[PDB]
Structures are given as structure tokens and as C-alpha cells.
Amino acid sequence: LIYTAGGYFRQSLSYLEAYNPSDGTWLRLADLQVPRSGLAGCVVGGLLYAVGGRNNSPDGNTDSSALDCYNPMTNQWSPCAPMSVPRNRIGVGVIDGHIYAVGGSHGCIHHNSVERYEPERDEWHLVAPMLTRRIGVGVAVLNRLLYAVGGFDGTNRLNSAECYYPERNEWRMITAMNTIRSGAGVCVLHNCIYAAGGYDGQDQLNSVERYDVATATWTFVAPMKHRRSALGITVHQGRIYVLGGYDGHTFLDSVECYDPDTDTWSEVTRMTSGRSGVGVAVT
Fold this sequence. Notes:
- The protein has strands at 2-5, 16-19, 26-28, 40-44, 47-51, 54-57, 60-63, 67-71, 76-80, 91-95, 98-102, 105-106, 109-110, 114-118, 123-127, 138-142, 145-152, 157-165, 170-173, 185-189, 192-199, 204-212, 217-221, 232-236, 239-243, 254-259, 264-270, 279-282.
- It is mostly beta strands.
- It has a single domain (4-283), classed as Neuraminidase.
- The strands form eight sheets. A four-stranded antiparallel β-sheet has the order 3-2-1-28, with no helix packed on it.
- Belongs to the KEAP1 family.
């Protein structure tokens, strides 16, 4: 199933919903302990993690360092050890069963720092920081290497990307995208990386490009039907799924699915309500 957690639709949300691409159904599950937008989702050992984000509520706003873990076999959430700092609009990747939290913001602070969480010990540890401060960064893992893509450094929105080597513990700049992207959806599909949509400081984007590591090159592919920033993204059975986002006018419930073999996007469902800044994963 495709789990979407949190999000934002004029206030941070606590929804945890699961989409079945063959049923078509949306399953309503245990609410998040705390409403959170701008978080990230990932899956380790079959367990679904919600990382970072921010609680926007009528009673106030606070960025979040929380890491929470959801068990589909119990339909229950359990808090884990928190990150060293709150990370709103965070990116996460998974390497060797460890969770890498990347970038984000905390008030006026624009993080270049990165930390790694170990599920078997419930410990976070800071690793080497990025060459760039990145809010709204896209993160993807290719052959056990961690790519951070795009974002917003507090002043400029970025098309640069960098690559983290865990055992050397260091970041190195790679070829930049063709499109400056903040809050894009970044994932790994088949044998390449995909950055889709986002915000360049003027327009919300529908363009999609993918990075090939062999040619170290970005190539434009079939764009989406709906421009969207702060979208959620995941890969299910060899197809890309993008959920919600913000098109500069309304918070979308559109869900689009990219078929790589045909280079085609198509709408497959609508979420139960429009929202942006969700965390998405599959388990």
C-alpha cells in the first residue's frame, strides 16, 4: 500500500491514509500523535517512519525534530528518539537500514547538517553536513549513495545536487538539474533518479527530469498533468506515484502515476482531501 502521513491544508494534519492501487480504496489508520506538515516518510524493516516537519495550528507553530514509527501489524504509532534539531521541509533517505535526515529549516535557520538514525539502537548521530543549506530538499538513494537535490538556501532556490558517501562520510557536488526546484518530489525508479515538480520562485512546476549516474546527466521526461510543489512521491511496483501538492491556487488531492515503459503520466485517484507537504512511503 501507499501510506501518506501528515500534510497541510490551512493547518497541519494528522491523517495517516493508505492507498491500494488495485482496490482503489483509501484506508484510514491511526492518526499521528502530533499534526505535522513538511515531514518525510520512509520504511525500514517494514515499519513506516514519519520524520521532522512542523506543527502549524491555530494555537501556534513549532518545527519538529520528532521521529515516529508506525507498525501496520498493530496499527499503532510509537515515538522514537528525536533528531538533534527540528527539521521542517526535510528530506530523508535510507541506506543499510539507517535513516538519513537531510536539510530543512528551524525558524530562520537553514540547515546544511545531516544526521543518521539507527533503528536497532534508537540513536541519532550527526554526520557530515552538506555543501549547501537546503530547505525543501529532495532526497534519494542510488546504489547506497545519498543524493540531495534542489531546495532553498534561504535566499536562492537551487538546481544543484550533491552526493553523500557514507563510508567516506563526505559530500561531493554532482551535475545540476536543468530546472531550479524547491519542494520537488525526488525518488529512485528502475535505474535512475527522478525529480518532479517543485517551485522555482516564480512558477510551480510540472516538468520531470531524471539523473543517470553513468552519464552523470539529467534528461527531461514526460511531465505531469498538474503543476505542484511540496508534493509527496513514492515508487510502487515500478511506477512513480505523486500525491497532492500546491499549484499556487489550491491544495490538490490529485494523484498521478508515471509509467516508465510508456513515459506517460495518468491520474489514478484523488486523496480524501487536498493537502501538501505530506510524507509518503510503501510497506
